């Protein structure tokens, strides 16, 4: 567990319907919801491989599991029953434990993705914005739509807004 | 001032999954790894149709029972379909030697 | 005249899933039979709306 989901980011967003992770913005032009395409796409690729690996490694050969034995062959009936029951036991236990562990790993993967997105935005903004908790940054300057898209698309240009931010940070 | 928040997705899904640390976890999306449904009908296998015995049994069909005329033509089948309790087998009472072995060897031809 | 990869006495299975719980006695390249009633793999996130 990494602390983002059900942690310092308490709840999810019903309004964000285009991705798993993203951003809410409140500028004077307006508020909105935008999914982070890069991180969500990486997660999609990972989970798709995960599912395809769990599904596609079950390559079975043409087999018939039904046999008929008379009464004078009862040891054979019991040996066949032991074989079938043992295989069913092994596969049931393996499938259950596989799903149980794989689900925990998937949830941890999503939690890691949200924290890394948060860390990336934090490192991008540096001291031009303040952490107001709940995974939100309050800016020390005015960001228009271009500023918000720069933060989202990964090219924030800190020196452009640093000096003005100082006049708001030391005040 | 101007703020940007980082968060995650949520929807109206009621799907629940079981994890090693918690049971009945509601999740946004899930996939099924278990098949629980069937067609209800017999299908072909490896492109080769099955052999349907009707009311005849394997012994009756292979001995040529008088009441077994409809099932007379076949070249290659992938498996045999038989009724749970066939009523036209060995019309003359008697013992069939190695019946189970014969059934095994006539399973697919 | 349907075509299937596995045949079951209650009816064929047209699926590519790795596991099934219809009937242990099956003919063909079949999903492995398990005694599980649920096999759901989380692909998404916890739902906290």
């Amino acid at each position, epitope marked *: 567990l990494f602390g983002a989901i059900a942690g310092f980011i308490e709840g999810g967003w019903t*309004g*964000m*319907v*285009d*991705g*798993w992770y993203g951003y809410h913005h409140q500028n004077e032009q*307006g*508020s*909105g*919801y*935008a*999914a982070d*395409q890069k991180s*969500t*796409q990486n997660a*999609i690729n990972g*989970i*798709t491989n995960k*599912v395809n690996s769990v599904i596609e490694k079950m390559n079975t050969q043409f087999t018939a599991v039904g046999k008929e034995f008379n009464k004078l062959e009862r040891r054979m009936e019991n040996l066949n029953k032991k074989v079938d029951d043992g295989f069913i036991d092994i596969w049931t236990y393996n499938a259950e434990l596989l799903v149980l562990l794989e689900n925990e790993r998937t949830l941890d993967f999503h939690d890691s993705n949200v924290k890394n997105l948060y860390e990336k935005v934090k490192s991008q903004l540096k001291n031009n914005a303040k952490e107001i908790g709940n995974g939100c940054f309050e800016f020390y300057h005015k960001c228009n*739509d271009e500023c*918000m*898209e720069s933060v*989202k*698309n990964g090219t924030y240009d800190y020196p452009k807004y640093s000096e003005e931010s100082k006049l708001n940070r030391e005040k | 001032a101007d703020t940007i928040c980082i968060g995650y997705h949520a*929807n109206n899904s009621t799907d629940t999954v079981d994890t090693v640390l918690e049971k009945n976890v509601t999740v*946004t*999306h899930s*996939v099924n790894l278990l098949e629980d449904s069937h067609n209800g009908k017999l299908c072909l296998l490896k492109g080769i149709a099955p052999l349907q015995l009707g009311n005849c049994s394997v012994a009756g069909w292979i001995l040529g029972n008088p009441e077994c005329e409809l099932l007379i033509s076949r070249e290659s089948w992938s498996y045999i379909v038989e009724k749970p309790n066939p009523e036209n087998g060995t019309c003359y009472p008697g013992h069939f030697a190695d019946y189970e072995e014969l059934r095994e060897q006539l399973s697919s031809v | 005249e349907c075509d299937a990869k596995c045949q079951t006495p209650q009816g064929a299975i047209n699926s590519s899933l790795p596991f099934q719980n219809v009937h242990p006695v099956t003919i063909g390249e079949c999903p492995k039979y398990v005694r599980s009633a649920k096999l759901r793999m989380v*692909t*998404g996130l916890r739902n906290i709306p």
Partner: antibody
Amino acid sequence: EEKLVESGGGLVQPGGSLRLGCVGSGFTFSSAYINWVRQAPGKGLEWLAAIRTSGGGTYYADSVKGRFTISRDDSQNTAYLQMNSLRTEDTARYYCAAGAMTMVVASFFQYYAMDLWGPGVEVVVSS
Amino acid sequence: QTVIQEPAMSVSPGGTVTLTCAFSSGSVTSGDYPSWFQQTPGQPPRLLIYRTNNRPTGVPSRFSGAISGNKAALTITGAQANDEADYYCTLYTSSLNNIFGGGTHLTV
């Protein structure tokens, strides 16, 4: 049964204004990014504008940046392209595209895929 | 900035083609997300390849896409004579900002 239908268009004098509308059916229109693309007669395709979902943002090309505005109304399942100060080079067939391709591991639509297109609407600018 | 593409190209039926799409700039990578479109006369464009190597469900397994050197390549193997159409490439310079190529008229 996914479908997009474009309205508006026709003949408009230079310097005028139009409002093209694309209506979507058969899919969750509020969850899809909507693109507006133009094809001049006897010429290749030219991407014009795009709009995200839930107020994510608007994206414009340099050709019509400042003249053309894009909006959407999810209650009516409509996407609007308002064109202002139309010149003579704006004569084209206009298509609305939607990224509406489903996935297996999520309920969203696939990124970087304009899969659903409309028949188009003709817009001609002359006297 | 501007995307360059072959003005025209012809192939014989039952042959391979190498429809190429390039930048008027440095190398083209998978981060540009090339997408190929097919347009016939009087008809809405159809997506054939998304994100370099992916096919929509309806597209037959005959069109293929890849990155070759610094160019985006689309290849057609079967050439069933219904491929006489204009093939466009789009390159994404941003999350939704994309640039279309000139287009290639393919005569079989």
